[model samples]
Target: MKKDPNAPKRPPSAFFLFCSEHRPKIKSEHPGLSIGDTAKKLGEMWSEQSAKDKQPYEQKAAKLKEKYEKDIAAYRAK
Candidate 1:
C-alpha cells in the first residue's frame, strides 16, 4: 500500500476521535452521520483475497477505493 504523506499521524483524526470516543452520548444527543460503516467496508477490501486470483478483484477494489476516497474527501472538507 502506498503511504500518504499528508495524512493524519494518529489512527483517528481529532474529529473522528471525538465521535468514536463519545458515540453513545453523541448519538443520543445529536445522532449525526456516523460514517463508521465506511471503515468496515474498507477493512473488507483489505482482507478480500480475490485480488490474488486469476480474475483478480483489483478492478473492483480499485473502484470501491476510489469511491470511498472521493466521498471521504468531500466529507472531511465539511
Candidate 2:
C-alpha cells in the first residue's frame, strides 16, 4: 500500500510548545514515564494533531507556516 500522503507534519515549535506545556501534567498523572520520556511522547502526539488540523502558526497565530519552520530551525541550530 502507498504511504498516506495526507499525513500532516506539525511545526517543530508548535510541537515542542504543546509538549512542553503538557509534559508536567502528563508525567504527574502517569508516573511510569520519566519527564523527558513523557515530553517526547506528548510532543509526537501533539505534532500529529497539529498536522492533521492544518492549524499552523503556533508561535503567534499571526505568522505564516514557514515562519514557524524558520524560527524553530534557528532556535534549534543555535
Candidate 3:
C-alpha cells in the first residue's frame, strides 16, 4: 500500500528518547548484539526505571509533542 505523503510524523516518546540515549552504550558493551536483543535489553531497562528517573524524559517528550502539533498545523496550511 502507498504511504500517505502528507502524514505528520509522531513525536518521540520518553521511552524512545531513553532508548536512543542508551543504544550506543549498550552496543559498545555487547559487541555484535542483534537488534531484537538490544530492544529486549532496553525494554528491561525502561521497566526498571523509577518514576523520578523518568520525569525529565517525560517532560521533554511532552514539549516535543506540543511542538509537533504546531509544526503539523503549519505544514498542512501550506
Candidate 4:
C-alpha cells in the first residue's frame, strides 16, 4: 500500500484482465453476492476454464504486455 505513486502501474494479465471483463457482468446476474463471493465465483469460473479458452486471454495479455514493455522502454529510453 506504500508503493510510491511516481511509477507507471503495470496492468494485470489474464487472470485479472479476465476478472475485470466479467466482474461487472457477473454482478449483473448475481447482484446479491458479497464482493468476496463475486471474486470467489470468478476465481472458480476461471479455474474451470479450459486451456483453449484461456488462450484468448493469453494472447490479449501478450499484446498488453507488448505495449507495456514498449511503454517502459520509451519512458526510460536513455
Strongest candidate by TM-score: 3
TM-score of each: 0.27, 0.41, 0.71, 0.61
Q: List runs of model 3 lying over 4 Å from the truth.
A: 1-10
TM-score of 2: 0.41
lDDT of 4 at 78: 42
Ranking by lDDT, best first?
3, 4, 2, 1
Worst 10 residues of 3 by lDDT: 1-10
Highest-lDDT candidate: 3
**Which candidate model has the greater TM-score, 3 or 4?**
3
Per-residue error for 65 in candidate 2, Å, reads 12
lDDT per residue as tens, model 4, 11-75: 55887766778778877787776668878887888878887657798787777777877776667
Q: Report the number of backbone clashes for model 2.
A: 0
lDDT of 3 by residue, 1-78 (tens): 332577666788988877888888878989998767888888888878887657788898889899988887788666
lDDT of 2 by residue, 1-78 (tens): 432344334445655556666777886778888767787787667756755433542743435456656755665545
Local distance difference test scores for all models = 0.46, 0.59, 0.80, 0.73
List where candidate 1 sits over 4 angstroms from the true fold: 1-56
Error of 3 at 20 (Å): 0.7
